[PDB]
Amino acid sequence: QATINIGTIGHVAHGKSTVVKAISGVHTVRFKNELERNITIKLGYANAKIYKLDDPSCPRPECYRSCGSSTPDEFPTDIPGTKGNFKLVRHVSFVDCPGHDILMATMLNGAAVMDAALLLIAGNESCPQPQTSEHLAAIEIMKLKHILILQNKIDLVKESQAKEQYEQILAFVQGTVAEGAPIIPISAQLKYNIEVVCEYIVKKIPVPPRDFTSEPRLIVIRSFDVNKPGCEVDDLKGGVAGGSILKGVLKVGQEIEVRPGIVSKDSEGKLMCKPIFSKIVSLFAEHNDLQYAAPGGLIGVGTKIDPTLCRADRMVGQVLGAVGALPEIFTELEISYFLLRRLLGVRTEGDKKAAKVQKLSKNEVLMVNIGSLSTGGRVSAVKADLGKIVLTNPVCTEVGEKIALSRRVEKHWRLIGWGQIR
């Protein structure tokens, strides 16, 4: 299954497929083929098995040696050991977030259900690069600090440039946790020092305490239909949710409720929403059958919902509770909030436009990323430490946790501040 969710976030032009296939062995993929124009801009999924020969390096199935195929310029070979079967240490899960700035709201959502991260830095561009800081800050807000910085694209980048970049990032982030996070330079054109990464992810990132006894909550981020185009009438199936569970052991045959709900017909107001109920058909993770779905892992829960809800990606950031979950489904919400004194996620060589942003004005639409949900809503009352927001589609608030608040600076939204629900 899975034990931890390590995320693979990283700004434009570092190469995703080479690094993702080295760590998991499962390709990051989704629509267009044209696998991506540059680096993956979709929310990729992948799981993997991490075993040892009693060595800090992680074998392949063929554990005698491993000859890469990253480049035919030279032969990159590494040796994990010699063969006689290897001991399974754990089953790991990844969360490949978008690597592009416009997709920030999606990157936030996907990130918010991980248990650790890997900041994929690229040495090609600017030294205190916008997105590195954006990522790091969001991570410390959500409730994580289990980060391993990875210098992913320094294959042709000289050692002065690459040294200056790690220095400037680590010096800018002087108020964000990063001093207890290692910085592992690797090759992505010769897959070198990959074996030492395997030692790091088992060290810096154990399994955090998971609450089995507590009531099941599944947060769905990806939508999958298994009926698909060309289905037969008596080959009928349910609709499958790619979600991570962050609380409770969800068992097979259990009934689960999707709690933001669907709005009642001919509503004259903003209420009323009614949750949808679906019975769990199957609990699939990796490529191995399971009867349980332990928390701390990203699992494909097939449920008895019908094709229309899974025919496109429409279940992004929905909260699912088993069953008749107590969590309130607000339509208008009381945010406590604070703002950054800089504009996060933007800053170029001329140092534009990380200038301090003006105060929020009422009746402006802002993206409130609450939980893994992403709703848009307008601010109806605006006091400094008390704003009232009215949301277009209702938000199930599992706990008052955190929020991330963004404002439409130009073409798309950009992160301005965070806070906590009251």
Binding site: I154, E159, K163, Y166, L170, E179, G180, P182, I183, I184, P185, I186, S187, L190, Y192, N193, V196
Partner: peptide
């Protein structure tokens, strides 16, 4: 912090031309 980096830098960059 930077020990992790420099150890692996002298591992990596010795194998470059």
């Amino acid at each position: 912090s930077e020990k992790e980096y420099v150890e692996m830098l002298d591992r990596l960059y010795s194998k470059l031309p």
